[PDB]
Each structure stands twice: as structure tokens, then as C-alpha cells.
């Protein structure tokens, strides 16, 4: 029921154990040195 | 000594080890240690450093 303003899709591949690190306030190898989400992140994280 | 231990204890006889006088630089675990679960309760993870 919504319209989205500035839609960006960020795609990558990680380990199964590192999927938990894709979150606004996570630490770890991926969250620190590879890909960090903002604290006020608005959007959806999808992993398969 | 903790995450690379050869043998772990049983859950009913879980082992407790004191940690003192050391620098908690957990980034050294990035190379070899992969964790399925990492949940902190009384502190945000990004503040641990």
C-alpha cells in the first residue's frame, strides 16, 4: 500500500554465518570492513 | 584458549574461565572464527571497542 522514494538494491554474497551481520547496529568482519548499514536505515534486508 | 580450545565441556558441567588483564581485540577472530550466533544483551556490539 506504499510508494517508495529512492529505491536502491545493494547485492552481494557472504557466508551463511555473516547474514546476521547485515543489520543497522551489528559488529563483525562484514559489518566493519565490508558493508555497514546506517543506524536509521529504512528498508528491507533479504538473504537466501 | 577460549574459542580455539581442543576440548569443550559438557553443558551440565559447563566450564567457567576468568578473563583479566588483557585487551579485548576481538578482530583477531575475524580471520579464522565464524559465528552463527552473536547476541549481546547489556551492551551494543559497536561499543565493545
Curated annotation (Swiss-Prot), chain B:
Q: What is the effect of changing residue 32 to F?
A: In strain: Omicron/BA.2, Omicron/BA.2.12.1, Omicron/BA.2.75, Omicron/BA.4, Omicron/BA.5, Omicron/BQ.1.1, Omicron/XBB.1.5, Omicron/EG.5.1
Task: Tell me which species this is from.
Answer: Severe acute respiratory syndrome coronavirus 2
What is the protein's quaternary organization? Binds to host ACE2. RBD also interacts with the N-linked glycan on 'Asn-90' of ACE2. Cleavage of S generates a polybasic C-terminal sequence on S1 that binds to host Neuropilin-1 (NRP1) and Neuropilin-2 (NRP2) receptors. Interacts with host integrin alpha-5/beta-1 (ITGA5:ITGB1) and with ACE2 in complex with integrin alpha-5/beta-1 (ITGA5:ITGB1). May interact via cytoplasmic c-terminus with M protein. May interact (via N-terminus) with host bilirubin and biliverdin, thereby preventing antibody binding to the SARS-CoV-2 spike NTD via an allosteric mechanism.
Name the job this protein performs.
Attaches the virion to the cell membrane by interacting with host receptor, initiating the infection. The major receptor is host ACE2. When S2/S2' has been cleaved, binding to the receptor triggers direct fusion at the cell membrane. When S2/S2' has not been cleaved, binding to the receptor results in internalization of the virus by endocytosis using host TFRC and GRM2 and leading to fusion of the virion membrane with the host endosomal membrane. Alternatively, may use NRP1/NRP2 and integrin as entry receptors.
Outcome of swapping residue 4 to Q: Reduced viral infectivity
Question: What is the name attached to this protein's record?
Answer: Spike protein S1
The glycosylation sites annotated in the UniProt record are: 4
Q: What is the effect of changing residue 29 to I?
A: In strain: Omicron/XBB.1.5, Omicron/EG.5.1
